[PDB]
Symmetry: none
Subunit: 131 residues, 4 copies
Amino acid sequence: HHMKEIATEYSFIKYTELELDDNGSIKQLSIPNKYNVIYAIAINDELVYIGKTKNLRKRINYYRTAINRKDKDSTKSALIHSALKEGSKVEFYARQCFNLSMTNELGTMTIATIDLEAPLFIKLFNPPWNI
Amino acid sequence: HHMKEIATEYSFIKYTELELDDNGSIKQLSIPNKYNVIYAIAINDELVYIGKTKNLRKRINYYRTAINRKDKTSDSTKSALIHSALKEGSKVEFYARQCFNLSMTNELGTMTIATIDLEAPLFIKLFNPPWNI
Amino acid sequence: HHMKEIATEYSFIKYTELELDDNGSIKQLSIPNKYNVIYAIAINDELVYIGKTKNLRKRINYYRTAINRKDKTSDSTKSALIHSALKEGSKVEFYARQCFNLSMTNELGTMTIATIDLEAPLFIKLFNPPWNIQ
Amino acid sequence: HHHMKEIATEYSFIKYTELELDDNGSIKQLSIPNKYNVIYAIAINDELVYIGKTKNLRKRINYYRTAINRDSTKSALIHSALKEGSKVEFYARQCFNLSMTNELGTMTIATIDLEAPLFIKLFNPPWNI
């Protein structure tokens, strides 16, 4: 699946493209954060993964460092690093989701719509990295 | 407009019966309060009015005291009809249906709705209660 | 956990009562139907069970039938508990709390939730009714 | 004057289409898939000029394309901008419908109805009088 066509149709915005610095480590982000999104990982404009997260910058930090964390499954982190070393384009796209809550005499029940959309998107696109 | 049937199928629960004290005013209640409810007023087991309120105890106290018209600009017509009913020996009951709150949060913040705002107009069109407009 | 207080706090409305006849049969139930609810079983006014159902008249009659037929293939612990309550001469009541549905639609289609699915777990954690196997 | 690109990323407005004139000076027809239940933004030379809401985007844009030919102020403003050689784009933020069904039947809330007023207040676009 070509990313740019999925982006237009399902309202994903390009959030960032990862780049290696002078010494081969992934440059950290210095752009505004996004919360409660479905994210798509694209390699060379091909959709490879559909994810969900409450904090996009935090998630991307995780992908940035996962394979280097001795204290800690970091396969996706490994693949992102490998792809960057070969010179492939790695991008994160984000689709904005929401929180819905109802408060009755039982208290508050909340639903993060990312929880609903992730499975539908994964079934819809069958991304390679989604197993 | 039979209250008993309506109560069952729409989960209205009888909240209180009103009555006059020796001075011709409505007795105070000693009942746990209820909040964010659709309320129904029934007279001799017949539905006469559908309302909504955030605070049922407060609303009922409003009907209790509105007759005295401390606030000349407040609507005292329903209070007047309630006192007339009691004066004529009729039974006056309040029923309450419990509603809730719905919220949604986006990048900006939180929009919240009390469902009484959604249900009230629908109940009024559905029942066409005598005291509603 | 007393059913009187629970019923008012959570708007449980009494739906029906079960009763044995002279030869020990659960009399028939003349009751309108009630769909999509949390139901409560009360024994001597005390909450013993929180259930959920798409169709309450059907669920109750299931209980009645299993007991009258002495059917033990049912996954029948509850039916067996109800019958011994009845036999011990206790009062057996069902209450219902009306629930509803929530739907959301976007380009992915329509997502929907029956609130009974949300409430049952919370009532069980709240009251720990005896008959609810956790 | 808010720059469309800033708004786009911050509030997830995606570029929907750029209007073009045909040789007869008429606005070309839309060729892209439709979108429903959106907040739309009108941008002229990358500047936000208007925030609106619609259940059917192609329908609304078609209205702007044909309105002056039949209050059609915005339509007229869009035509003059295009004739002046200015870039005119529509951006869209995807919204949704929520429904509740109980004993009363079905009550529905369209989020475009919630979000439109907030964006208009937030950005205070020139065309939003």
